[PDB]
Amino acid sequence: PQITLWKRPIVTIKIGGQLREALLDTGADDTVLEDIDLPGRWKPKLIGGIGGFVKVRQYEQVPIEIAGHKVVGTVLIGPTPSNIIGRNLMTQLGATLNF
Amino acid sequence: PQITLWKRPIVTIKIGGQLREALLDTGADDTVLEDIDLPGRWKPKLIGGIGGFVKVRQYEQVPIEIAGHKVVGTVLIGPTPSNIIGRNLMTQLGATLNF
């Protein structure tokens, strides 16, 4: 799709059989979702850092559908003030900013 | 331009005769720049809020050039971990996310 920026660019995502929403955030390096579970192995990762780091769980090679488009990539599960799709998945979408 | 998302989408800006850089941030409602001065009247604005709000100065109807494209809009001046171009100016650019 072509998404204008008059509103926050919130899209529907499907991940691990869970239907959720998330913000397409070009100011985020990584994807962070709070309200899901994922199976199998993970690795600890520290995010944030201003006033302290937050420990989250890094899940690799995760199949995720974003606004109807299926991709694979890294998903961090842990606290976040909003679900965020970061550049790591937007590059898998082929997503560009255009003006 | 067409900007891919393999790196942070940092662009050159020109504002009030000052050449600077800033991140095109679709996860930001507003534009916030730290390292500039602007002339004339402003209004106080509170931003942030998690752990407390930060007071900044809102400047209205500011002419700003973003990656060579001249627009007009609101600019907040005050502390920010990085200079940010938010959706308020990206709508003035006609900027879309496309995939």
Q: Is A29 an 8 Å CB contact of chain B?
A: yes
Query: At B92, which helix (H) or strand (E)?
Result: helix B87-93
Query: At B7, which helix (H) or strand (E)?
Result: none
Q: Measure Cα distances from B92 to A88, B1, B64, B74 in Å.
A: 27, 15, 10, 10
Residue whose C-alpha is closest to residue B28's, from B87, B92, B90: B87
Domain count, chain A: 1
Residue A39 φ then ψ, to 5°: -85, 160
Tokens of A84: 């965020």
B27: region left, alpha or beta (phi > 0 left; psi from -120 to 50 alpha): alpha
In Å, how far is B31's CA from the nearest CA of chain A? 12
Q: Are strands A69-77 and A96-98 parallel, antiparallel or unpaired?
A: unpaired
State whether A84 and B27 contact (CB < 8 Å).
Answer: yes
DSSP-assigned beta bridge partners for residue B15: B18, B64
Question: Could you tell me the maximum CA-CA distance found in chain A, to the nearest angstrom?
Answer: 41
Find the residue in A nearest to B81 (Cα). Answer: A50
Q: According to the entry, how was the structure determined?
A: X-ray
Tokens of B12: 């050159």
State whether A99 and B95 contact (CB < 8 Å).
Answer: yes
Residue range(s) defining the domain that contains residue A38: 1-99
Q: Measure Cα distances from B15 to A66, B34, B74 in Å.
A: 36, 12, 12
The full DSSP string for B11-66 is EEEEETTEEEEEEE-TT-SS-EESS----S--EEEEEEETTEEEEEEEEEEEEEEE
DSSP state of B94: T
Quoted resolution (Å): 1.3
Looking from the CA of B24 toward its CB, the CA atoms found within 13 Å total 30
Find the residue in A nearest to B2 (Cα). Answer: A98
Note whether B88 and A7 are within 8 A (CB): no
Residue A40 C-alpha from the chain's centroid: 18
Neighbours of A34 (CB within 10 A): 16
State whether A87 and B29 contact (CB < 8 Å).
Answer: no
- CA dist A63 and A75 (Å) reads 9
Rg of the Cα trace of chain B? 13
Q: Is A19 an 8 Å CB contact of chain B?
A: no
The identity of residue A32, as a single letter, is: V
State whether A99 and B97 contact (CB < 8 Å).
Answer: no
Q: Is B48 an 8 Å CB contact of chain A?
A: no
The full DSSP string for chain A is -EE-SSS--EEEEEETTEEEEEEE-TT-SS-EESS----S--EEEEEEETTEEEEEEEEEEEEEEETTEEEEEEEEES--SS-EE-HHHHHHHT-EEE-
